[PDB]
C-alpha cells in the first residue's frame, strides 16, 4: 500500500475557497511529480497542472491560472491544490496523481476528492406517490414509484418495504431542477400483490434528519 491519499468531499458556496490535500506514502515523494487532473460531469478528463517536488515549481495549463494554486508541505510530504473565488462550474472530482519522469504516465492515482459548489440551503425532500391512473395492466406485473423531489444535498436513500423488494426496483439518478435534486424509484411487483398487499416506499435524507414512508394506495 504505496498510495496517494486525498481529502473528503467539500460542499461550498460560490465564493469561498478549498484547499484539497494529497499525502503520499510509501515512495520517495521527491522522485516523482505530483500532477492534478479534473473530472467534470460528462466533460473530458481535463489535466490541470503539475508540481515539481525537486524545484518546487508548478506549471498550470493556461486554463486553471488566476484562481487555482498548487503548493506543497514537503516536510510533511503532502501536495495541496487550492481554489478560490469558487464558482458553480468547479463542481467536479479532483484527482492527484503520481507523475513519472522517465515514461510520463500516471501510475498511482489518488482516490479523488469531489467538490460540489452550490448555494442551495439544506432542504428535506417532498416524496409524492405514483399509483397507476386506472391503466389496467399489460401483462401481470404492475409498476408503482415514488417521486422524491426538491432536495439538497445528495444523498437520498430509497428502499421499498424496508429492503424487501429489491429485484424489480430501479432507482434513477438525481437531476438538478433549479438548484435542488429530483430522483424516482420504481417497483415492479406481481399484480396479485398490489393493491392486495401493501407496497410502501422509504426515503431517508440524512443531510436533514428526515425519513418518510409513503404507502402507494390506488389511484
Amino acid at each position: 500500500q504505496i498510495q496517494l491519499v486525498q481529502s473528503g468531499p467539500e460542499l461550498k458556496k460560490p465564493g469561498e475557497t478549498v484547499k484539497i490535500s494529497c499525502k503520499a506514502s510509501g515512495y520517495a515523494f521527491t522522485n516523482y511529480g505530483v500532477n492534478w487532473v479534473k473530472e467534470a460531469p460528462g466533460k473530458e478528463l481535463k489535466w490541470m497542472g503539475w508540481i515539481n517536488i525537486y524545484t518546487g515549481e508548478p506549471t498550470y495549463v493556461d486554463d486553471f491560472k488566476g484562481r487555482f494554486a498548487f503548493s506543497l508541505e514537503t516536510s510533511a510530504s503532502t501536495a495541496y491544490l487550492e481554489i478560490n473565488n469558487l464558482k458553480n462550474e468547479d463542481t467536479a472530482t479532483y484527482f492527484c496523481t503520481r507523475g513519472d519522469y522517465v515514461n510520463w504516465y500516471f501510475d498511482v492515482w489518488g482516490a479523488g476528492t469531489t467538490v460540489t459548489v452550490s448555494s442551495a440551503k439544506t432542504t428535506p425532500p417532498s416524496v409524492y406517490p405514483l399509483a397507476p391512473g386506472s391503466a389496467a395492466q399489460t401483462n401481470s406485473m404492475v409498476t408503482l414509484g415514488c417521486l422524491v423531489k426538491g432536495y439538497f444535498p445528495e444523498p437520498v436513500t430509497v428502499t421499498w418495504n424496508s429492503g424487501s423488494l429489491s429485484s424489480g426496483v430501479h432507482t434513477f439518478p438525481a437531476v438538478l431542477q433549479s438548484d435542488l435534486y429530483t430522483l424516482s424509484s420504481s417497483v415492479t411487483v406481481p399484480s396479485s400483490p398490489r393493491p392486495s398487499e401493501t407496497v410502501t416506499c422509504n426515503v431517508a435524507h440524512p443531510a436533514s434528519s428526515t425519513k418518510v414512508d409513503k404507502k402507494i394506495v390506488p389511484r
Binding site: L45, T97, Y105, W109, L147, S186
Partner: protein, 216 residues
C-alpha cells in the same frame, strides 16, 4: 491541445469475445527523442483510473495477457482478447508526447443483449403535489435495450419540450437492459387546463412508437 478522440462511445461485447477500442491523435505522438507517449487507462465504475498500457504496447505490472496494444503515429488500437467480468469499464487513451497531456473521451465496454422493447408506464400528478400547486407527470421506460430511445411528450395533441427532465440507469447487472424515466413538470394551474397527456417512445423494437397515455 492534442485532441484525442476514440470511438465508439459504447462497445457491446459478449464476455468470451475479443474487443478492440481504437483511438486517434490530432498531431503525432512520435516524440523528438523518437518515442511515443500514448498510454491507456481503464476506470471501473465509481473508482479512479488504473494504468493499463504505456508507450503504445507495453503492458503494466499486473495487467494480464489479453491486453495486446498497437498502432502508430496517429492511430493506436487496444485489443482485449477474451473479455471477462473483470475488465468491463471506461477505457481512456492518453497522450504525454506533447504538453499539456490530454485524455481521450473514453469508450464504455458493455454487455451485448438480445433486444428488448421498453415496458413504459405513465403516472399523473399526485393529489398532494397538486395541493401545493405543481404537477409533475412521470413516464418510466423500463428494462429496454439498446440505450438509444426517444421519449417525446405529446401534451394535448401538440408536443412540448420544456420541463422534461430525463434520467437514466446504467446497465442493470442482472439483465443487461437499461431503464430511463422522464418527468415533465407543470404549474398545477397549467395542468388543470389540458386533457390528453401522452408520454411516447421511439425505439428500435417497434417501427410504431410505443405510446401510453391518460386523459386528464
Amino acid at each position: 491541445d492534442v485532441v484525442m478522440t476514440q470511438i465508439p462511445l459504447s462497445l457491446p461485447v459478449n464476455l468470451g469475445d475479443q474487443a478492440s477500442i481504437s483511438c486517434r491523435s490530432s498531431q503525432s505522438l512520435i516524440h523528438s527523442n523518437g518515442n511515443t507517449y500514448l498510454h491507456w487507462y481503464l476506470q471501473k465504475p465509481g473508482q479512479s483510473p488504473k494504468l493499463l498500457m504505456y508507450k503504445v504496447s507495453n503492458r503494466f505490472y499486473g495487467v494480464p495477457d489479453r491486453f495486446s496494444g498497437s498502432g502508430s503515429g496517429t492511430d493506436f488500437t487496444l485489443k482485449i482478447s477474451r473479455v471477462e467480468a473483470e475488465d468491463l469499464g471506461i477505457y481512456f487513451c492518453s497522450q504525454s508526447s506533447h504538453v499539456p497531456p490530454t485524455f481521450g473521451g473514453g469508450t464504455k465496454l458493455e454487455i451485448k443483449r438480445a433486444d428488448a422493447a421498453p415496458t413504459v408506464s405513465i403516472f399523473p400528478p399526485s393529489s398532494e403535489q397538486l395541493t401545493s400547486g405543481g404537477a409533475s407527470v412521470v413516464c418510466f421506460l423500463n428494462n429496454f435495450y439498446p440505450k438509444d430511445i426517444n421519449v417525446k411528450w405529446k401534451i394535448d395533441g401538440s408536443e412540448r419540450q420544456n420541463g422534461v427532465l430525463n434520467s437514466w440507469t446504467d446497465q442493470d447487472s442482472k439483465d443487461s437492459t437499461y431503464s430511463m424515466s422522464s418527468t415533465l413538470t407543470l404549474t398545477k394551474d397549467e395542468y388543470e387546463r389540458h386533457n390528453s397527456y401522452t408520454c411516447e417512445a421511439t425505439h428500435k423494437t417497434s417501427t410504431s412508437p410505443i405510446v401510453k397515455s391518460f386523459n386528464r
